[PDB]
Amino acid sequence: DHIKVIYFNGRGRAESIRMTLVAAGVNYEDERISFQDWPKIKPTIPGGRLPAVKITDNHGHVKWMVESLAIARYMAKKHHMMGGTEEEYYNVEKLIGQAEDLEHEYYKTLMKPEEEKQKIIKEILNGKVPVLLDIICESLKASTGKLAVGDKVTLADLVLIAVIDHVTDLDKEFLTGKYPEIHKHRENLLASSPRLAKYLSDRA
Amino acid sequence: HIKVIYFNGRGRAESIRMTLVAAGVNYEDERISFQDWPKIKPTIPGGRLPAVKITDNHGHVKWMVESLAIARYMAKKHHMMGGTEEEYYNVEKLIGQAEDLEHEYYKTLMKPEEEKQKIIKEILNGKVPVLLDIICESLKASTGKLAVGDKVTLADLVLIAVIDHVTDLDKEFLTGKYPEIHKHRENLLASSPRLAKYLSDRA
Ligand SMILES: N[C@@H](CCC(=O)N[C@@H](CS)C(=O)NCC(=O)O)C(=O)O
Ligand SMILES: N[C@@H](CCC(=O)N[C@@H](CS)C(=O)NCC(=O)O)C(=O)O
């Protein structure tokens, strides 16, 4: 099976799919679509929206998968990253749901002129952003291990690092000297997964 | 003992109420008024509703928060998150399509009856028919008569909740259009007499 990840932004919705495969040691091909070629590639993608993943087997037959975090939960489930008990599965989904609520505040600043972006940025940062960072911080304090859920990598860890990178894109000092548990989660995750540290280091 | 703690009657907790109804699992509804939220807020872990408080035989309490993480945990416990990895992907796919449509609906909420009208006319000419077409195509790919296969999943219950929100915005919006969505609802209510009874009684 040849796996191609089709997307437009480098650290958008497809990052959860790339990090789940990286952590699993699963190889894939990146295919980035420019704004310029989207009008003619759109009708070719089932449902007309990115990211999408095209899986071509040895005989050339193609399977398509859409909806970014439904693709990431399927890949994570196949590689034992959706928890190891039903209880662990609830805690993985709990943090995923918390991170996605923070990502939704970040999306409100996107593809806007650089004056309205500034206005929306100062509202969320004094708004729902610190509220949701505190809820995620408390969730991390409840884990029975050093990562988000227990002590082994799950999809919850990778969605969290992706969303925290979006917050620091809005204001790079936002977390300086605050939310130690978030900071610590990142150090712990990169130590549990050499592949992800290599991926991230290298992406930087 | 399971208590579902919430404020709106057909808001985020509906996914949790319908998973329990479909599973034949009894629970208690505890609706919080706008007037009592200031003092009950500090008592709920995370400070946000809906929440589910589970009190066992000896009085010990477990809390669960984040609506669709509670609903996928109950659905998983009752065979409603698909029967193969492939069905689970398709369950999650439709869930993610429905939540994108619910996000358009949330943009109209708790607004003065003026700008609510303004936001309604933009989404209904916007992302709302785009996402209803994508859901309609997803239902046509199912290997059975419901959203995923032929037995109830969480994907079916999130879809009826979100479709009820669209008709709240414009009651004629699906009249004479999207036959697969209409058909899905008829099929689901015949597959789960408990849910037909719940909705009927709710109505
Ligand atoms: N909830 C879906 C959202 C897919 C989506 O909204 N994609 C947008 C950008 S990430 C898109 O393709 N826009 C272009 C178009 O559809 O013409 C997911 O997470 O995959
Ligand atoms: N993503 C969370 C959202 C929880 C949330 O946003 N709750 C809102 C209303 S549904 C709330 O409790 N607002 C009141 C407050 O926290 O003071 C879920 O689906 O459970």
Distance in Å, CA A99 to ligand 1 centroid = 18
Distance between CA atoms of residues A133 and A182, nearest Å: 9
Whether A147 contacts A153, CB under 8 Å = yes
- How close B164 comes to chain A (CA, Å)? 22
For chain B, counts of helices (H) and of strands (E) = 9, 4
- List b or e across A6-37, with b for residues whose CB sees 16 or more CB atoms inside 10 angstroms: bbbeeebbbbbbbbbbbbbeeebeeeebeeee
Tell me how far apart the alpha carbons of residues B71 and B51 are, in angstroms, rounded to a whole number: 11
Task: Give the right CATH number for A81-204 from 3.30.300.180, 3.40.190.10, 1.10.287.70, 1.20.1050.10.
Answer: 1.20.1050.10
End-to-end CA distance of chain A: 29
What is the structure's resolution, reported in angstroms to one decimal?
1.8
Q: Answer yes or no: do A67 and B96 touch at CB < 8 A.
A: yes
Cα separation, A138 vs B48, whole angstroms: 14
A1-80 with A81-204: one CATH topology? no
Per-domain residue ranges for chain B? 1-79, 80-203
List chain B residues with CB under 8 Å of A94. Answer: 64-66, 69
Q: B108 CA distance to ligand 1 centroid (A)?
A: 21
Residue count (chain B) = 203
DSSP annotation of B12: T
* B11 ligand 2 Cβ < 6 A: yes
CA distance linking residue B185 with residue B194, whole number of Å:
14
Type of residue found at B132: L
Cis peptide before B50 (omega within 30 of 0): yes
User: And the tokens for A68?
Assistant: 């970014």
Q: How many CB atoms lie within 10 A of CB B142?
A: 19
- Integer angstrom CA distances of residue A56 from A29, A44, B194: 11, 15, 42
Peptide bond just before A43 cis, omega within 30 deg: no
Spatial contact of B164 and B174, defined as CB atoms under 8 Å apart: no
- Chain A residues whose CB is inside 8 A of the B46 CB are 135, 138
| Cβ-Cβ contacts under 8 Å for B73 (sequence gap 6 or more) | A86, A87, A89, A90, A93, B64
Residue from B73, B95, B99, B103 whose CB has the most chain A CBs within 10 Å, to mutate: B73
B102 touches chain A (CB under 8 A): no
Beta strands in chain A (DSSP E): 2-7, 29-32, 52-56, 62-66
Burial, B75: exposed, middle or buried (Cβ in 10 Å; 0-12, 13-18, 19+)? buried
Task: Give the number of other Cβ atoms within 10 Å of residue A197's Cβ.
Answer: 13
Distance between CA atoms of A201 and B50, rounded to whole angstroms? 39
Mapped onto helix, strand or coil, the DSSP state of residue A40 is helix
**B30 forms bridges with which residues in the sheet?**
B5
Q: What DSSP character marks residue B36?
A: G
Query: If you compute the radius of gyration of chain A from its CA atoms, what whole number of angstroms results?
Result: 18
The CATH class of the B1-79 domain is alpha beta
- Burial class for B14, CB neighbours closer than 10 Å (0-12, 13-18, 19+): buried
Superfamily of domain A1-80: Glutaredoxin (3.40.30.10)
Closest CA to B189 of B162, B156, B165: B156
What does the buried/exposed string (b/e) look like for B15-43 if buried means 16 or more CB atoms within 10 Å of the residue's CB?
bbbbbbbbbeeebeeeebeeeeeeeeeee
Q: What DSSP line would sit under B75-127, residue for residue?
A: HHHTT-S-SSHHHHHHHHHHHHHHHHHHHHHHTTSS--TTHHHHHHHHHHTTH
- What approach was used to elucidate this structure? X-ray
Residues of A in contact with B64 (CB under 8 A): 90, 94
Return the CATH class of domain B80-203: mainly alpha
Q: Given the structure tokens 């949330």, which residue do they identify?
A: B106
